[PDB]
Nucleic acid binder design. Structure first.
Ligand code: CA
Ligand code: NA
Length: 276
DNA sequence: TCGACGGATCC
DNA sequence: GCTGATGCG
DNA sequence: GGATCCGTCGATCGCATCAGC
């Protein structure tokens, strides 16, 4: 079935207006996404922080259009060291964060340009591009090593300040989070080991799944559709991109959106509203 | 993701 | 410069 | 014993890069 995201809810459950709009988006090749007019959409959506994943672009090749974003003038990039046109993430913010770091404090996992951390007054924001488990699960062993290291690291962070984690976490948590759960139980993104890892990340830090806190019963809500087999037009997709929130930010949560119509990638954008 | 193929399983 | 592969999703 | 379910397989799209010439 198809799915219509409901209108933006911009008031907290205590009547306070939203003061921060975070937009996350796996662009799957920054340079191609630019040509497919993805920055035009970002300009209209006008967020305070933009998080992009799977950038496939070294910083010395960063397109010139990124210099035409006045409301997003503070930009931070993490490329891999060895591989080219592979992974890479970006974090752009209207105001300058207090401190910016890269990776998760573990040498084995900081080589691929997947994590950026920005600290603000009231919270720390982590944007993430979690390693896919791979065709034939030939990275699933590494991904469990990732999940373990990443979970610990985030718990350390969330114990200091309220944490927002956004990005492509490369797993559909429950059956409701993808269109064909029955047939994907041994494919990357829906194995038992990645599903449990996600549940463990939720229960251990702890963190809530913003979208599921607000619409626990809503199915057919996805952020990725394969380019093949005309999946996007049949809404045969996966929910892979998340805003994960500290429980102490839930009183501040106004809405968590899935921007289904915005093209440019095999992922769509998600955006978070918070009253801070 | 989807189709085509053989090989169970079902009342 | 073209064409069609590869690695990775 | 006609139908339906089952688990493999292969190919499919796109980006960025490379091989070859
Ligand atoms: Ca020749
Ligand atoms: Na290559």
């Amino acid at each position: 079935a198809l799915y219509e995201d409901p209108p933006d809810q911009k008031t907290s459950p205590s009547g306070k207006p939203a003061t921060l709009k975070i937009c996350s988006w796996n662009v799957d090749g920054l340079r191609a996404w630019i040509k497919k007019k993805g920055l035009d959409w970002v300009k209209e959506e006008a967020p305070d922080i933009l998080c992009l994943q799977e950038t496939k672009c070294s910083e010395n090749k960063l397109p010139a259009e990124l210099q035409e974003l006045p409301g997003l003038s503070h930009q931070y990039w993490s490329a891999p060291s060895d591989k080219e046109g592979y992974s890479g993430v970006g974090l752009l913010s209207r105001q300058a964060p207090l401190k910016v770091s890269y990776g998760i404090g573990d040498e084995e996992h900081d080589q691929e340009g997947r994590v950026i951390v920005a600290e603000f007054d009231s919270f720390v924001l982590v944007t993430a591009y979690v390693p896919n488990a791979g065709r034939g699960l030939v990275r699933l062993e590494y991904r469990q090593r990732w999940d373990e290291a990443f979970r610990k690291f985030l718990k350390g962070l969330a114990s200091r300040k309220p944490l927002v984690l956004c990005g492509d976490l490369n797993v559909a948590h429950e059956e409701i989070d993808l269109r064909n759960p029955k047939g994907n139980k041994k494919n990357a993104g829906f194995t038992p080991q990645e599903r449990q890892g996600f549940g463990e990340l939720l229960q251990a830090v702890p963190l809530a799944d913003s979208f599921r806190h607000l619409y626990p019963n809503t199915p057919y809500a996805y952020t990725f559709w394969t380019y093949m087999m005309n999946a996007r037009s049949k809404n045969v997709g996966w929910r892979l991109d998340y805003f994960l929130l500290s429980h102490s930010l839930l009183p501040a949560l106004c809405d968590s959106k899935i921007r289904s119509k915005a093209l440019g990638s095999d992922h769509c954008p998600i955006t978070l509203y918070l009253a801070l």
